[PDB]
């Protein structure tokens, strides 16, 4: 029975970097496609990145591109997101999601619980006007 457990999200400074983790159970992890999808306050869902069984082909959204890195540990059946170059647009509840079948072009069968990433110093700081 799919149990996707997520840790590591916390408050971070802009220009910061986080490492999210999501651990899976009760499914042959290493045969399935895995994705990270985020959810911004006052926003719907955006799929971020997908990784392919072998930790083969990975795909990212344009927003996330060079800043975020997705890696699987199959030996401990874990999923990783390395978020470099954090900007406020990246504030969100991050979910690890299991592809219903073993392919990218799939709905999501099973979701984790959500980890929050608050990329905020102190809103914005401008005085001259």
């Amino acid at each position: 029975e799919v149990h996707l457990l997520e840790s590591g999200g916390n408050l971070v400074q802009p220009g910061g970097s986080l490492r999210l983790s999501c651990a899976a159970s009760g499914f042959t992890f290493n045969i399935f496609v895995m994705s990270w999808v985020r959810q911004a306050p006052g926003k719907g869902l955006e799929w971020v990145s997908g990784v392919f069984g072998s930790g083969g082909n990975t795909d990212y959204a344009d927003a996330v591109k060079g800043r975020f890195t997705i890696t699987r540990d199959n030996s401990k059946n874990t999923l990783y997101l390395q978020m470099n170059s954090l900007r406020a647009e990246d504030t969100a509840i991050y979910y690890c999601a299991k592809h219903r079948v073993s392919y990218v072009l799939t709905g999501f069968d099973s979701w984790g619980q959500g980890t929050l990433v608050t990329v905020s110093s102190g809103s914005a700081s401008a005085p001259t006007l």
Partner: protein, 115 residues
């Protein structure tokens, strides 16, 4: 990308009611669509996949119609357990795209703002 649109934004019904949501695509998507339920402070939960198929153990009350452009999701009877934000997701291509969402709610207090 594919733009997905969700008609309408919010609604209020009543226990027992039949309720219908419209999810519209940009591209022709064949029937590569998924519905999600999301009760507040919960992960999304897969309802319907492949436009029509009910995920296992969903109640036959939730329904999904359409192909290509327009999609419909229907709840023949309102249950207090269905309070939630509904979503549609396309899987015709990458980036996988979700639609804005449809927040479903009970009728309570305010005028059914009918002026």
């Amino acid at each position: 990308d594919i733009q997905m649109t969700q008609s309408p934004s919010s609604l209020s019904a009543s226990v027992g009611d039949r309720v219908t949501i419209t999810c519209q695509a940009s591209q022709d998507i064949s029937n590569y669509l998924a519905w999600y339920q999301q009760k507040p402070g919960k992960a999304p939960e897969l309802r319907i996949y492949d436009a029509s198929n009910l995920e296992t153990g969903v109640p036959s009350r939730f329904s999904g119609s359409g192909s290509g452009t327009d999609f419909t999701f229907t709840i023949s009877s309102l249950q207090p357990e269905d309070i939630a934000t509904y979503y549609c997701q396309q899987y015709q291509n990458l980036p996988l795209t979700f639609g804005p969402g449809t927040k479903v709610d009970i009728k309570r207090t305010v005028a059914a703002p009918s002026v």
